[PDB]
Design a protein around this nucleic acid. Structure first.
Ligand SMILES: Nc1ncnc2c1ncn2[C@@H]1O[C@H](COP(=O)(O)OP(=O)(O)O)[C@@H](O)[C@H]1O
Ligand SMILES: Nc1ncnc2c1ncn2[C@@H]1O[C@H](COP(=O)(O)OP(=O)(O)O)[C@@H](O)[C@H]1O
Ligand SMILES: [Mg+2]
Ligand SMILES: [Mg+2]
Lengths: 46, 190, 257, 235, 259
DNA sequence: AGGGCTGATCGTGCAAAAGTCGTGCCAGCCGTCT
DNA sequence: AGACGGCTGGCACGACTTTTGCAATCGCAGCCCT
């Protein structure tokens, strides 16, 4: 509408973490294998 | 509702978190903190993925209730963008959700991607799902006189009586999908 | 689908208009409805769209006059992708509604001259109103117009271009005046009274006094349906429990005591 | 009992109160034909106290200077009507609301999915809604649905016999608030000055003028003599 | 090199010579300006020019002239490189930038903003433009197509149209024969329109036109060159019955009072 | 004694090229009737 | 016994799908080179 600039207040590049999260939800039974694989590496998750 | 048994769940190791918080070694504490951050990100991602899948399934059901209740014949021609419009996520998220997902309902067990179907022009202005069109074609073909099998052109005319707007080539493809034999082959001695 | 003519005008003029609408229903061209304040023009257009061969997909009766700005109406006609920021609604949806459908507007005289020119350019080509950085899409859409103001009066004013007025006006539907119609008015009043007695779930229908009916006929009632419904509601609020035929008209909120 | 704020001895006022009580038993929308000042907020407060469901929460929504983002925030996409629960929030300055805002509010009432609530409703406007609709300044459907039952309100000029009783009640309230011993009394000059006053405001104006006159007097011994609302005055 | 004659109707008058001149001028890529008949025919002239242009020459970019009050028009003309100009914050190409080597079908809308015309003067100055917030200018090539509906010299004298705007444009002027002046293919164009309308309405047979109808058409002013006549033919077909007695009943337009 | 500059931390999409189908359309052929 | 016909299958083209490949800018300061 009327031309202007920012006069009041109101995105993201998902990295490898959120990128693999998006790469997740591909399957469920297969997702369990990857989750077990991650839980093996992560020592603070049960 | 999502299947409670099937959904995986992760829990933060409270003993490990307590040990890392009170870790005497600074390096060990930093490693524990990094591991906790990674685990929290993973848990949040898993929960968000499950919630997004649930919301997408609810939205899909909202529009596919006709096929869910009446049957395959009353399947609305729907596309990925159609589902994407009802939600705030993109069609890419729709494709990711509609990946190797099977949902059980009173009708039976069906894949998430099986919901989406092609749009066929029809008389009366409306568009029909190609899966529903193939189901109707199969129902008509099965309920036919064995002595005189229906021609693909004849079947096309019969469906045009219901408003096919098809040239029987797509009908031929659907018959191939259902492995319908030729009109000459289908006919047999009474 | 099938045209709905509930409480159709008993006047033979209404029947002739319906016959012309039935004749034009198989055709696919714009229509102009010369209506009045609450004359029932938009409902007639909706009934025609129901009778317009198929159901004609989506049917939208958005009025440019009842819009905050002409720019909003233009955005409803077509929204450029990425233009400005944010919106009260998905503006391209209004354009998509005409796709596989018709175009219906009310009080078209209020449309801006630039907006009218954009619409005239779109109608001849059929393409989308706003390009949005891409070639506009020619959606198969019909059209319909309903303005109380005279098209020749607008031409004299010059607000609408000669081509706009000519190509826009393909069919004319002159709504008979509500005050002029008497038998149709009585039939519609009886139908509305029956419908209200049913919907309001009153155990007994009060009916209508002869003096009350004469007073209602004496009223100008420019709103053939809008004012009729308002007066019906005014009488219903003064519910006489099927025993008071006074039918007091409290439609005017300003009127009191 | 809500202390019976604005006790209108007028038969028209009593009829308006009875109509408001009848509307309160219902949980359906109704229109209040009244202006600011004329539509005293005490009447709306008494109506809220007269809610059919005492457990029912009333938010008493009114026009606010909310931006477009704030407008969306007031909507679910947390709804504003969610703040109230089974109560007729008396909408104020409905004529000042935007056309899009008016349409959104109307869709919230007995409608859904307008673009391709467990609470009652109440509204009041000082302007001619039928004229605004005729001027195309408001949604006709919203005006019709909201005006299920228009409840007119009496202005200051309407209350003539009850004006003296209202003045006495206001004087008593001011004496209680200002620690005055009692109402010192009025004079024919004071009554004539009050009567001659056109009173453009009904409720707030009367209370403000009473407060100003009390501050001018500040005594409960000498009865009231005269008062004015001019920018300045002198002997 | 394709015909694409389309619905090129009403050439029995000197419009055949106009089409010959247009064909002669078609190979040149210089500025193209016309004078269309007021009310009808400018779109047909533009389509004929586009057909004269090679199909593979480029896209036929058409814009209806509008004032500069809409900043979107300015972004479309000059471009939009910086943020808050048009589209995304990136270099969203404008309508002029959208046309690279294609026809620029201008419209003589006589828009109020002379500033818009002044900006367009730079659009065709040396074949270059700069986007809104454009760090570097871009030299572009495109064909230009223009038309007219009023007396350009009258506006030049009156100052309604910028003198430089007329000077830079209008390499040659193409005049459309008026409907009151063409008057030659009225029978032929009317028959073509009637055949098209009968096909659209699925009329069983051609109804035929009475000699009184032809005399009335001759007496008709016909403000629109090829659209008003077609609209009148459609209105008459609506009120007539094909190969029946109702064929005589012809309706000029619904705007006229009912019989 | 003053400059370079070094790594901590961060982030539910999309888009762009590719693929891929829906639908129609052409070519041949064999069962057949002529 | 050569042609009609319906099937079938190859071919093509816009219109729905989708997948992978990216990983921005930001303030701390002490240490090392000059
Ligand atoms: N022939 C009819 N039968 C029954 N109802 C009618 C008829 N014509 C009009 N109405 C009623 O009149 C009301 C208003 O119609 P209309 O004036 O066309 O709408 P708008 O206010 O958009 O112009 C509609 O709600 C419709 O129910
Ligand atoms: N031979 C023809 N072929 C196609 N269209 C024609 C022919 N003759 C007249 N017309 C019609 O005349 C109309 C001219 O309209 P146009 O020149 O765009 O109006 P304006 O000059 O008011 O902008 C076109 O819509 C076109 O349909
Ligand atoms: Mg209306
Ligand atoms: Mg034009």
């Amino acid at each position: 509408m009327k031309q202007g600039l920012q006069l009041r207040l109101s995105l993201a590049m998902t990295p490898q973490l959120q990128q693999a999260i998006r790469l997740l939800q591909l399957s469920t039974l297969e997702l369990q294998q990857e989750l077990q694989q991650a839980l093996e590496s992560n020592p603070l998750l049960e | 509702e999502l299947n409670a048994d099937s959904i995986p769940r992760l829990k933060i190791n409270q003993q490990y978190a307590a040990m890392g918080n009170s870790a005497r070694n600074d390096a060990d504490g930093q490693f524990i903190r990094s591991n906790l951050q990674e685990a929290r990100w993973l848990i949040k991602s898993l929960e968000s993925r499950n919630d997004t899948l649930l919301r997408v399934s609810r939205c899909i059901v909202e529009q596919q209730q006709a096929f869910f209740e009446q049957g395959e014949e009353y399947m609305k021609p729907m596309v990925l963008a159609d589902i994407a419009q009802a939600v705030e996520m993109h069609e890419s998220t729709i494709s990711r959700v509609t990946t190797q997902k099977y949902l059980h309902s009173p009708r039976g067990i069906f894949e998430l991607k099986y919901f989406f179907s092609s749009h066929v022009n029809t008389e009366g202005g409306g568009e029909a799902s190609s899966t529903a069109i193939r189901a109707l074609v199969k129902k008509l073909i099965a309920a036919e006189n064995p002595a005189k099998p229906l021609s693909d052109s004849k079947l096309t005319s019969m469906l045009s009586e219901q408003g096919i707007m098809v040239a029987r080539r797509t009908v031929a493809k659907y018959r191939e999908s259902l492995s319908i034999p030729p009109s000459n082959q289908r006919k047999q001695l009474v | 689908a099938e045209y709905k003519d509930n409480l159709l005008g008993e006047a033979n003029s209404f029947l002739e208009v319906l016959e012309q609408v039935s004749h034009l229903a198989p055709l696919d061209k714009p229509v102009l409805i010369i209506g009045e304040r609450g004359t029932g023009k938009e409902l007639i257009a909706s009934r025609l769209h129901y009778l317009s061969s198929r159901w004609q997909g989506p049917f939208i009766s958005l009025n440019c006059a009842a819009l905050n700005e002409n720019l909003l109406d233009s955005e409803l006609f077509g929204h450029e992708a990425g233009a400005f920021t944010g919106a009260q609604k998905r503006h391209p949806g209004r354009f998509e509604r005409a796709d596989g459908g018709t175009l219906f507007l009310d009080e078209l005289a209020t449309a801006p001259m630039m907006v009218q020119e954009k619409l005239l350019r779109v109608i001849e080509y059929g393409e989308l109103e706003r390009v949005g950085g891409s070639q506009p899409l020619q959606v198969n859409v019909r059209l319909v117009c309903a303005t109380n103001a005279d098209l020749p009066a607008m031409v004299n004013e010059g607000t609408f271009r000669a081509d706009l007025l000519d190509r826009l006006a393909f069919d004319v539907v002159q709504l008979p005046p509500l005050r002029e119609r008497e038998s149709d008015i009585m039939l519609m009043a009886e139908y509305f009274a029956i419908q209200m007695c049913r919907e309001i779930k009153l155990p007994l229908f009060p009916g209508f006094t002869e003096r009350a009916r004469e007073t209602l006929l004496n009223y100008r009632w420019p709103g053939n349906i809008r004012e009729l419904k308002n007066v019906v509601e005014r009488s219903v609020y003064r519910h006489g429990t099927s025993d008071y035929p006074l039918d007091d008209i409290i439609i005017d909120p300003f009127k009191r005591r």
